[PDB]
Scaffold this active site. Structure first.
Site, short mmCIF file in Angstrom:
data_model
loop_
_atom_site.label_atom_id
_atom_site.label_comp_id
_atom_site.label_asym_id
_atom_site.label_seq_id
_atom_site.Cartn_x
_atom_site.Cartn_y
_atom_site.Cartn_z
CD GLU A 141 9.07 13.10 21.77
OE1 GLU A 141 9.94 13.64 21.06
OE2 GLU A 141 9.19 12.96 23.01
N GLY A 182 -1.04 2.25 -5.85
CA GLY A 182 -0.86 0.86 -6.19
C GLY A 182 -1.88 -0.03 -5.52
CB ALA A 206 4.29 1.32 -12.99
CE1 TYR A 244 -2.90 -11.40 -1.47
CE2 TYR A 244 -3.18 -9.70 -3.10
CZ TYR A 244 -2.50 -10.79 -2.63
OH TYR A 244 -1.42 -11.29 -3.32
N1 LIG Z 1 -1.16 -7.62 1.06
C1 LIG Z 1 -1.56 -7.26 -0.15
N2 LIG Z 1 -0.62 -7.14 -1.17
C2 LIG Z 1 -0.97 -6.78 -2.43
C3 LIG Z 1 -2.29 -6.53 -2.66
N3 LIG Z 1 -2.38 -6.19 -3.97
C4 LIG Z 1 -1.16 -6.21 -4.56
N4 LIG Z 1 -0.27 -6.57 -3.60
C5 LIG Z 1 1.17 -6.73 -3.81
O1 LIG Z 1 1.69 -5.80 -4.74
C6 LIG Z 1 2.77 -6.39 -5.42
C7 LIG Z 1 2.94 -5.81 -6.82
O2 LIG Z 1 2.70 -4.43 -6.82
P1 LIG Z 1 1.24 -3.90 -7.18
O3 LIG Z 1 0.66 -2.94 -6.16
O4 LIG Z 1 0.26 -5.06 -7.35
O5 LIG Z 1 1.59 -3.20 -8.58
P2 LIG Z 1 1.86 -1.63 -8.68
O6 LIG Z 1 2.61 -1.01 -7.52
O7 LIG Z 1 0.54 -0.97 -8.88
O8 LIG Z 1 2.72 -1.59 -10.04
P3 LIG Z 1 2.57 -2.76 -11.12
O9 LIG Z 1 3.57 -3.86 -10.75
O10 LIG Z 1 2.90 -2.16 -12.46
O11 LIG Z 1 1.13 -3.23 -11.19
C8 LIG Z 1 2.44 -7.88 -5.44
O12 LIG Z 1 3.54 -8.71 -5.12
C9 LIG Z 1 1.33 -8.10 -4.42
O13 LIG Z 1 1.65 -9.06 -3.42
C10 LIG Z 1 -3.24 -6.65 -1.63
O14 LIG Z 1 -4.41 -6.41 -1.86
N5 LIG Z 1 -2.89 -7.02 -0.36
#
Ligand SMILES: Nc1nc2c(ncn2[C@@H]2O[C@H](COP(=O)(O)OP(=O)(O)OP(=O)(O)O)[C@@H](O)[C@H]2O)c(=O)[nH]1
Ligand SMILES: Nc1nc2c(ncn2[C@@H]2O[C@H](COP(=O)(O)OP(=O)(O)O)[C@@H](O)[C@H]2O)c(=O)[nH]1
Ligand SMILES: Nc1ncnc2c1ncn2[C@@H]1O[C@H](COP(=O)(O)OP(=O)(O)O)[C@@H](O)[C@H]1O
Ligand SMILES: Nc1ncnc2c1ncn2[C@@H]1O[C@H](COP(=O)(O)OP(=O)(O)O)[C@@H](O)[C@H]1O
Ligand code: ALF
Ligand SMILES: [Mg+2]
Ligand SMILES: [Mg+2]
Lengths: 428, 428, 355, 334
Positions: A245, A10, A90, A215
């Site tokens: 541990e 993700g 997803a 980010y």
């Molecule tokens: N801290 C941080 N959070 C992120 C970043 N990219 C995505 N997120 C968080 O990921 C959340 C959503 O999940 P995603 O990873 O973007 O999506 P996914 O798990 O790939 O699945 P999808 O929702 O289908 O895209 C969001 O609320 C974002 O805040 C990032 O680069 N840094």
């Protein structure tokens, strides 16, 4: 060779892992190619040539992020075999990543990770990076975590996901993803770390004193967090304590396994001159209620564990004095049967900040993995959000139409309620 | 690579599509010939979702041009960016439905349907993965409405998985252009809501006034209106076709904005609406942009948000922007427009920043709101329907082509049902 | 002793009368005899508090900690030793009411291996509800012919799968649409349906045989919806009156969760049916002003059965084994909720042909 | 024995619950067959829709097309072929409810000669509601004797003509006033009335014969006294169970309403308004606006069951009042 591996799934997972691996290559003097122009053998398999391949695999159902990291400076760092890519995200559905499209790449990634495990000499555990409200970060990760527990169970499955923020909510269906992945994570997670967005915003606002961070900075802080976590494996300290541990040290009970991170110092370059950087003052600063990475009031939850990780020229005498002083504080709270919870990860390998980053060069740095009943309130509010969304059965058609049912929705909800009961009964 | 198919219908449909492909070619640096000549490799790389490469850098847009009057495609050939299409795609009839929906669905359209369906499904099989169908059409005339309805019926009966997306041009509340356009629109939207999952309400007078005052235009040619629609549509999918810090796609907009199956009619919105030379009386920046994007002054229909509530919003923020300010701004507009805001569904926002901005414009955003204000439009449409129905006003044209009022009665009943759903969720 | 036997028979007849005249749906929970293979694999415990109340304690350790006394009282609970006549005895007054000029719909809620086809079709061994219902219908037809009522039976067969309607009687691919009749807004019919006139019970048996052969030709039977519409019209030349009634034999798909052994689209349509039915029944219980009746084809087809003038039956086919205890208890909860439901009062339609 | 009547007690409690849930208030219509002295009488076109709906139609074609629809639905429709047993079948559950401590109202409504007296009192050849009710009540008391219950019947006979109550069990004219009961503000009682204790069906038959004789009926003898008076027969039930206490008190109010034809209607209009207000769940019911409604405080409450019979004469000259009675019934069914 206490060799461990990490997976990144993700957008949160892949970027966080990118930060983690750039920091590791920097702290180890590793070029983007993969050589140092031993200590690092735990995370970098050494090829026949002068190359140390990271023991990490980036997997996503969406080729955009893996494509960009292939276009990043670290394609030569990564063996292109690990970069397992899907086709479509997803759609922010746990249903998808756990029932529909997962069952089609899980075998591939499991073969990859078993290949790495047989490559590894002494296996320690797993480092999965993902989200909670994101679709793939819930579905796909629950599938992997249960599958690996089936595979090993004995290994230290260290889940390192992102806890969704209370107020700001980028997506709209986060309650569903969160409740579902936790339903499928609680029974097989050794311990899942928790990170919030609003707290990182407040830290970069008032401590790092940066008005507009991307980010990249959040992930930089996460990367420093994990680097300090794993320095005991990567380096020798006065008191080295490893992940094995941690299971017994942190959780008091099998299921109460959701500690929250906190980094210190969190000051920018300007305050480096305004501070002489004592161990006692950072020891106090990491405990203060506006320094944690999760939006809770730690003064309102009895602590059960506070694993303190240190690095740099730090003597245990003054650390012992400082923790004794903090134990004498009134606001700080603990449970009865754990009155001596202060286990320290003192180490004499100083941290190094990435060039072009935010944090300054600090002789000492400390991270604490607090685990307290204060996050019970955050769990309660997220469960409330889920309950109200599910009250009118809004949106539920997608999840039921990608392999889901309301019966285990209510089962997960009562599992959350039992989790809260455990929290309050540990609090007393 | 999750490609998308492009459909044309009606004179308005063909013209808006023409300007849209001109806009996209500008986006990716594509010459009118078909050969790539831009500098950004990134656009060219991902160009497969739209421009399927044929030979030697000549990219054929995945375009299907359907009409019954050859004049429109003749103009396209004569017009620039018409020859760029593969001439096999200009699949049109000769007679003409004559703004008669029954003619557009059972006369000449009913035989040109297969001769366009072959080409469209051959193009689909020529592509790797598919997402949905964009019926770039109008409900004004009968042609682009009747054959559009038949074609979506066929596509749905053959493809159940894809997410189609019609950009229907809803008739103006006042500047009526067709004597029997209410019947045409009602019959079309019956079958649409029977199958479709996302439409839009664009009023010719809405854009007329927007360019008259907001843009300070004196000659609102259809060039201006269809340019705005092109920019809007381009922003709808720039998330999918381009990388971003937080990337989205048609799937996101498909599965987040519909709490219910039927309730799937949408209102777009775009910013900044700078006039010809208004760079001095304000300074361009993202806060003023977000302020001027959510107002009823910058909507797209005549459905004033002063009588409806934003059920969900899906601001995309194509470009480079700060999540912090947009979170604060959405919170504040929630505070102020709570009355015109669904109290039942909180935390409704879909920030999906995509890195690349439009040409020559640093900042951009596409508002997508599910305002519970379309029911007034449907009520006026149904009132026009029944007023023309008491005397069956000019019904002989439809009835003579083997059609019965049963379908008109059912379509009116279903639009009353749609109004009932809109009000029933606006008040509740 | 003869007076005691008369009192017992009249008490049983009165109990049948009240429970059939009871408003809404006569929710029936039937437990089929447990299969020996599944018995030795895994089974749970059940106790019948009475002939109409069932309690699946299951005496587990974790399931018991989550779900203990699962006692639900219904209109009638059938033992595993219950015969086919035990379940047709109360359906006989239902068929009498249907022939009286009332619309009737019959449902069988159960998962794979529940015994739904054992209820309606009856399995190659023994007979089911359908043939005995036909025989009783024809016996009542001849009895009313002796009473001067001339009745005609019209049969239409429809199968619902993945949003695509399939004619069980005709193999040709036809576009089927379900629409309300022009004469009245309540009754709803299907266009381009293979409709035949029943000539004799032998013809109906042959039609049933060929329909079931196509159905088997079409493990799809475990997870598919088939709708049988038996429309009856009764003319009385002396009275110039017409009595119109319909019988709706509907077998719902398997209620099992997606789990692993299931395909996507079929699971999705099963979820559509179950979720929309649950939503509409909970809205009815909530006395909601508007029931979203036009979201799925299943509820829109049975508008007279669900929102019109008809009496509906629930057959709760539940496997008594512990391995499916979650789905069994969920189905029992749904059955209790629909037992708590109410329906519009049954109205007899008399059409006088004086004009 | 003990278990038998315990199950009977549970069954009657559930029957009372069922009656309360159904709606208690039920309207029925009965049509009197023509007699040997009315064979030359113009009847009406009675089209029987169902057993719960009937439409009456005038023979005159000139007025037939000038009246529109005259269809009215009820809870049950009784045709001339119906015997008194069919009418009483809908009264026995109410008799049981009275045995259980609920107040029961039985009303006969219609014009003069409709058959209200025949519906309630009947004839020696075919007994009415009252004798069958008395027989069933005594049989039920004999059954209750097996479960300690001791039931005593107190019958009061009174007549209301011009908002003045008269005692039919004694010729000693007195002034009687309807006042709230001493131990219950909701319950009512009337002073100076002869409240005899019923011992057997013969005693109550003698009491009702004496009340009828002292009534001096003139329904057909001048159409002055009986045709414009209300015959209210009240049967009080006092259930007393020994060794357990928990006594229960019920009442049976057999009321024979006066003629509803156009000319006292002071009591009848108020009764109609009270019934309509009860059907409308009105907060305030004008109970005290008439003597007949004032007497029936405990018998028109939420738990009380009310029964009404709409008798209509199947004659053309009675059409104008039959339609009014059926409109009154439609004011209940809708
Ligand atoms: N801290 C941080 N959070 C992120 C970043 N990219 C995505 N997120 C968080 O990921 C959340 C959503 O999940 P995603 O990873 O973007 O999506 P996914 O798990 O790939 O699945 P999808 O929702 O289908 O895209 C969001 O609320 C974002 O805040 C990032 O680069 N840094
Ligand atoms: N956005 C936009 N809309 C147009 C334009 N030209 C026409 N329209 C609208 O689209 C409708 C066109 O009718 P159409 O379906 O094309 O006619 P037909 O093809 O003969 O049946 C009219 O009602 C106009 O309101 C244009 O250039 N841009
Ligand atoms: N009362 C019963 N007696 C004997 N066998 C039964 C009974 N009920 C169910 N069965 C068995 O259960 C199996 C279920 O088959 P079927 O009814 O076709 O599927 P489903 O139960 O899913 O509708 C049948 O093979 C039948 O042998
Ligand atoms: N079914 C019947 N058969 C024969 N005679 C009847 C019948 N019904 C009523 N009567 C006659 O009517 C008389 C009773 O008058 P009735 O009509 O009951 O008075 P009211 O108008 O007060 O009801 C009796 O004398 C009886 O002879
Ligand atoms: F197995 Al059965 F329907 F459930 F065929
Ligand atoms: Mg079956
Ligand atoms: Mg009399």
């Amino acid at each position: 060779m206490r060799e461990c591996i990490s997976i990144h799934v993700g957008q949160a997972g892949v970027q966080i892992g990118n930060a983690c691996w750039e920091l590791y290559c920097l702290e180890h003097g590793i070029q983007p190619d993969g050589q140092m122009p031993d200590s690092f053998n735990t995370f970098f398999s050494e090829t026949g040539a002068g190359k140390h391949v990271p023991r990490a695999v980036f997997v996503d159902l969406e080729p955009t992020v893996i494509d960009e990291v292939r276009t990043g400076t670290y394609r030569q760092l990564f063996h292109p075999e690990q970069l397992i890519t899907g086709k479509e995200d997803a759609a922010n559905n746990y249903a998808r990543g756990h029932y529909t499209i997962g069952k089609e790449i899980i075998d591939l990634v499991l073969d990859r990770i078993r290949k790495l495990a047989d490559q590894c000499t002494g296996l320690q555990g797993f480092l999965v990076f993902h989200s909670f409200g994101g679709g793939t970060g819930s579905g796909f990760t629950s599938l992997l975590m249960e599958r690996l527990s089936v595979d090993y169970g004995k290994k230290s499955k260290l889940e390192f996901s992102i806890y969704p923020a209370p107020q700001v909510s980028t997506a709209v269906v986060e309650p569903y993803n969160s409740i579902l992945t936790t339903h499928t994570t609680l029974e097989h997670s050794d311990c899942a770390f928790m990170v919030d967005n609003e707290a990182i915003y407040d830290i970069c606002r008032r401590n790092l004193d940066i008005e507009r961070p991307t980010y990249t900075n959040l992930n930089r802080l996460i990367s420093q967090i994990v680097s300090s976590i794993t320095a005991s494996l990567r380096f020798d300290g006065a008191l080295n304590v490893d992940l094995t541990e941690f299971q017994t040290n942190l959780v008091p009970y099998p299921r109460i396994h959701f500690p929250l991170a906190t980094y210190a110092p969190v000051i920018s370059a300007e305050k480096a001159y305004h501070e002489q950087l004592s161990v006692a003052e950072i020891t106090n600063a990491c405990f203060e209620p506006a320094n944690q990475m999760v939006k809770c009031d730690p003064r309102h939850g009895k602590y059960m564990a506070c694993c303190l990780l240190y690095r740099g020229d730090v003597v245990p005498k003054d650390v012992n004095a400082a923790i004794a002083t903090i134990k004498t504080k009134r606001s700080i709270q603990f449970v009865d049967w754990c009155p001596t919870g202060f286990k320290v990860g003192i180490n004499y390998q100083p941290p190094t900040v990435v060039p072009g980053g935010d944090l300054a060069k600090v002789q000492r740095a400390v991270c604490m993995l607090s685990n307290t009943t204060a996050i019970a309130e955050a769990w309660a509010r997220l469960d409330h959000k889920f309950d109200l969304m599910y009250a009118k059965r809004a949106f539920v058609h997608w999840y039921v139409g990608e392999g889901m049912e309301e019966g285990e929705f209510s089962e997960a909800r009562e599992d959350m309620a039992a989790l809260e009961k455990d929290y309050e009964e540990v609090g007393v | 690579m999750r490609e998308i198919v492009h459909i044309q219908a009606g004179q308005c449909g063909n013209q808006i599509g023409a300007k849209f492909w001109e806009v996209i070619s500008d986006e990716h640096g594509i010459d009118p010939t078909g050969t790539y000549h831009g500098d950004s490799d990134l656009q060219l790389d991902r160009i497969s979702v739209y421009y399927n490469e044929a030979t030697g850098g000549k990219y054929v847009p995945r375009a299907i041009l359907v009409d019954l009057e050859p004049g429109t495609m003749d103009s396209v050939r004569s017009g620039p960016f018409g020859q760029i299409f593969r001439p096999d795609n200009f699949v049109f009839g000769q007679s003409g439905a004559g703004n008669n929906w029954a003619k557009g669905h059972y006369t000449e359209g009913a035989e040109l349907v297969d001769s366009v369906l072959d080409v469209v499904r051959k193009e689909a099989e020529s592509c790797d993965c598919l997402q949905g169908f964009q019926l770039t059409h109008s409900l004004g005339g009968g042609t682009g409405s009747g054959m559009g309805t038949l074609l979506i019926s066929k596509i749905r009966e053959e493809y159940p998985d894809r997410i189609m997306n019609t950009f229907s041009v809803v008739p103006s509340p006042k500047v009526s252009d067709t004597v029997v356009e209410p019947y045409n629109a009602t019959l079309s939207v019956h079958q649409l809501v029977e199958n479709t999952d996302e439409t839009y309400c664009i009023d010719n007078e809405a854009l007329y006034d927007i360019c008259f005052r907001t843009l300070k235009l004196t000659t609102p040619t259809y060039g201006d209106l269809n340019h705005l629609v092109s920019a809007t549509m381009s922003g709808v999918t720039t998330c999918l076709r381009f990388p971003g810090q937080l990337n989205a796609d048609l799937r996101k907009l498909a599965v987040n904005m519909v709490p219910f199956p039927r309730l799937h009619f949408f209102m777009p919105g775009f910013a900044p609406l700078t006039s010809r030379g208004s760079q001095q009386y304000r300074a361009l920046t993202v806060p003023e942009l977000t302020q001027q994007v959510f107002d009823a002054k910058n909507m797209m229909a005549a459905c004033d948000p002063r009588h409806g509530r934003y059920l969900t919003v899906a601001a995309v923020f194509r470009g480079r922007m700060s999540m912090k300010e947009v979170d604060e701004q959405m919170l504040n507009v929630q505070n102020k427009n709570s009355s015109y805001f669904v109290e039942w569904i909180p935390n409704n926002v879909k920030t999906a920043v995509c890195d690349i901005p439009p040409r020559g414009l640093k900042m951009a955003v596409t508002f997508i709101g599910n305002s519970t204000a379309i029911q007034e439009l449907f009520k006026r449409i149904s009132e026009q329907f029944t007023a023309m129905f008491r005397r069956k006003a000019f019904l002989h044209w439809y009835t003579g082509e083997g059609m019965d009022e049963m379908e008109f009665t059912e379509a009116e009943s279903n639009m009353n049902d749609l109004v009932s759903e809109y009000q029933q969720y606006q008040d509740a | 002793k003869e007076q005691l036997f008369q009192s017992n028979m009249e008490r049983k007849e009165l109990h049948n009368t009240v429970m059939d005249l009871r408003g809404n749906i006569r929710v029936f929970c039937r437990i089929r005899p447990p299969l020996e293979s599944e018995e030795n694999r895994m089974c749970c415990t059940w106790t019948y508090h009475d002939e109409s109340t069932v309690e699946l304690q299951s005496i587990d350790a974790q399931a018991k900690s989550k779900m203990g006394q699962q006692i639900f009282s219904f209109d009638q609970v059938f033992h595993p030793l219950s015969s086919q006549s035990d379940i047709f005895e109360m359906v006989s007054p239902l068929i009498q009411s249907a022939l009286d000029g009332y619309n009737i719909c019959i449902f069988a809620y159960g998962q794979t291996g529940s015994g739904k086809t054992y209820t309606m079709d009856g399995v190659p061994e023994s007979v089911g509800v359908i043939p005995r219902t036909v025989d009783l219908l024809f016996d009542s037809i001849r009895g009313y012919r002796n009473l001067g009522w001339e009745y005609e039976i019209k049969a239409t067969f429809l199968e619902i799968k993945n949003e695509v309607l399939y004619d069980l009687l005709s193999n040709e691919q036809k576009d089927m649409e379900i629409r309300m009749a022009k004469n009245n807004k309540n009754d709803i019919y299907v266009s381009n349906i293979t409709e035949e006139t029943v000539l004799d019970p032998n013809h109906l048996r042959h039609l049933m045989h060929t329909a079931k052969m196509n159905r088997a030709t079409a493990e799809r039977s475990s997870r598919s919806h088939a709708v049988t519409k038996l429309e009856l019209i009764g003319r009385h030349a002396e009275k110039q009156e017409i009595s119109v009634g319909s019988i709706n034999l509907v077998d719902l798909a398997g209620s099992e969760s997606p789990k692993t052994s299931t395909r996507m689209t079929e699971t999705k349509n099963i979820n559509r049916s179950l979720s929309e039915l649950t939503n509409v029944i909970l809205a009815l219980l909530q006395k909601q002003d508007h029931i979203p009746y036009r979201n799925s084809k299943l509820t829109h087809l049975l508008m007279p059965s669900l929102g019109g003038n008809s009496k509906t039956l629930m057959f709760i086919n539940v496997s008594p084994f512990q391995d499916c205890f979650q789905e069994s208890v969920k189905s029992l909860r749904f059955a209790a909720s629909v037992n708590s439901c109410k329906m519009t009062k049954a109205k007899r339609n008399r059409y006088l042909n004086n004009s």
